[PDB]
Design a protein around this ligand. Structure first.
Ligand SMILES: CC(=O)N[C@@H]1[C@@H](O)[C@H](O[C@@H]2O[C@H](CO)[C@@H](O[C@@H]3O[C@H](CO)[C@@H](O[C@@H]4O[C@H](CO)[C@@H](O)[C@H](O)[C@H]4NC(C)=O)[C@H](O)[C@H]3NC(C)=O)[C@H](O)[C@H]2NC(C)=O)[C@@H](CO)O[C@H]1O
Ligand SMILES: CC(=O)N[C@@H]1[C@@H](O)[C@H](O[C@@H]2O[C@H](CO)[C@@H](O[C@@H]3O[C@H](CO)[C@@H](O[C@@H]4O[C@H](CO)[C@@H](O)[C@H](O)[C@H]4NC(C)=O)[C@H](O)[C@H]3NC(C)=O)[C@H](O)[C@H]2NC(C)=O)[C@@H](CO)O[C@H]1O
Length: 243
C-alpha cells in the first residue's frame, strides 16, 4: 500500500542527502523501516483515490522532512533534498514534561523532539507508546535509536486525532469537515492546517514564516515526484493556532 504509492527509488530521490556526512542520522532512516512502520497503520497511503494516497504519503514525508531537515537554500540539490538529516531535536532546551494524571513523566527523562515527526511532550510519548506497545514514557530514547519505532511514532501522530485537532491523515485525504471554530480561525482543509496541527503554536497565524515555507517546499517537490497536485491552502500564515 505504501510500497504501491512510493517505491524505494522514489523514497531515495526524495530523501537524497539523508546519508551525507553532514547528517547526524546518517544510516538510521531506511525504506524498510518506513514500510514496516506503515504496516501498523493500514489507512496510511491507502485511503481514498490514488491522488489522495499520493498526497497522504507526500505530505507525511514533507512535514517530517522539515522536522528533521539539514537543508539550506544553496545546499546541493536545493533545500528540499535534505530531509531526514536529524533524529533528535538540536540543542533541546527543555524536559517537555507537562504534569498530568494521564501521562506521568519518568524521573530523569526528557520528551524533546525525536524521530521523523520530532515527537515531543509526555502527552505525545505516552499515547504513542501505548499505541505501538512500547513504554515511551519510560524509554523515550527508543524513538531515536530504533528506526521502526521511530517511523511508527511519526505515523501515530499523523493518523491520530487529538480533539479539537483532526488527524493530519483525515485532512490530507479530504475527510475533514472544519467546525465553526475552525472557519472563524481561517483553518481550511489543506497542507497548511497540517503544519498547524504539528507545530501551529510556534509557526502559524503570524504571517510569513520560513519553517512553514520549508514544509511547503518539501511538499511541492515530493508531490512533483509522485505525480500529484498539491491541493489548496498550503500555508498557515493566516490561521489561528488550535490553542
Ligand atoms: C547564513 C547561512 O546561509 N548559513 C548556512 C546555514 O543556514 C546552514 O545550516 C542550515 O541552516 C538551516 C536554517 O537556515 C537549518 O534548518 C533548520 O533545521 C532544523 C533541524 O532540523 C529545524 O529544526 C526543527 O524545527 C522544528 C520546528 O519547525 C522542530 O519541531 C524540530 O524539533 C527541529 N528539528 C531538530 C532536529 O532540531 C529548523 O526548523 C530548520 N530551520 C528552518 C528555517 O527551516 C539546517 O538544519 C542547517 N543545516 C545543518 C546541516 O545544520 C549551513 C549548512 O548548510 O550553512 C551555513 O552557511
Ligand atoms: C520549543 C519548541 O521548539 N518546541 C517544539 C514542540 O512544541 C513541538 O511539539 C508540538 O508542540 C505542540 C505545542 O506547542 C503540540 O500541540 C499541542 O498538543 C496538545 C495535545 O494535543 C494540545 O493540548 C490539548 O489542548 C486541548 C484544547 O485545545 C485540551 O482540551 C486538551 O486537554 C489538551 N491536552 C493536553 C494533554 O494538554 C495543545 O493545545 C497543542 N498546542 C498547540 C499550539 O497546537 C504538538 O502536539 C507537538 N507536536 C509534536 C509532533 O509532538 C515539536 C514538533 O514540532 O518540536 C519542538 O521543537
Amino acid at each position: 500500500s505504501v510500497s504501491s504509492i512510493i517505491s524505494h527509488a522514489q523514497f531515495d530521490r526524495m530523501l537524497l542527502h539523508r546519508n551525507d556526512g553532514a547528517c547526524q542520522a546518517k544510516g538510521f532512516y531506511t525504506y524498510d523501516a518506513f514500510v514496516a512502520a506503515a504496516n501498523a497503520f493500514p489507512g496510511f497511503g491507502a485511503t481514498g483515490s490514488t491522488d489522495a494516497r499520493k498526497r497522504d504519503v507526500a505530505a507525511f514525508l514533507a512535514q517530517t522532512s522539515h522536522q528533521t531537515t539539514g537543508g539550506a537554500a544553496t545546499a546541493p540539490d536545493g533545500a528540499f533534498a535534505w530531509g531526514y538529516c536529524f533524529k533528535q531535536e538540536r540543542g533541546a532546551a527543555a524536559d517537555y514534561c507537562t504534569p498530568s494524571a494521564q501521562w506521568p513523566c519518568a524521573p530523569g527523562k526528557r520528551y524533546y523532539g525525536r524521530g521523523p515527526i520530532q515527537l515531543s511532550h509526555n502527552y505525545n510519548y505516552g499515547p504513542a507508546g501505548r499505541a505501538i506497545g512500547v513504554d515511551l514514557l519510560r524509554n523515550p530514547d527508543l524513538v531515536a535509536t530504533d528506526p521502526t519505532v521511530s517511523f511508527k511514532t511519526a505515523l501515530w501522530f499523523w493518523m491520530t486525532a487529538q480533539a479539537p485537532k483532526p488527524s493530519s491523515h483525515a485532512v490530507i485525504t479530504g475527510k475533514w469537515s472544519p467546525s465553526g471554530a475552525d472557519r472563524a480561525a481561517g483553518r481550511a482543509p489543506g497542507f497548511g492546517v497540517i503544519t498547524n496541527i504539528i507545530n501551529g503554536g510556534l509557526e502559524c497565524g503570524h504571517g510569513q514564516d520560513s519553517r512553514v515555507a520549508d514544509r511547503i517546499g518539501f511538499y511541492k517537490r515530493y508531490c512533483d515526484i509522485l505525480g500529484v497536485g498539491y491541493g489548496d491552502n498550503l500555508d498557515c500564515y493566516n490561521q489561528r493556532p488550535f490553542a
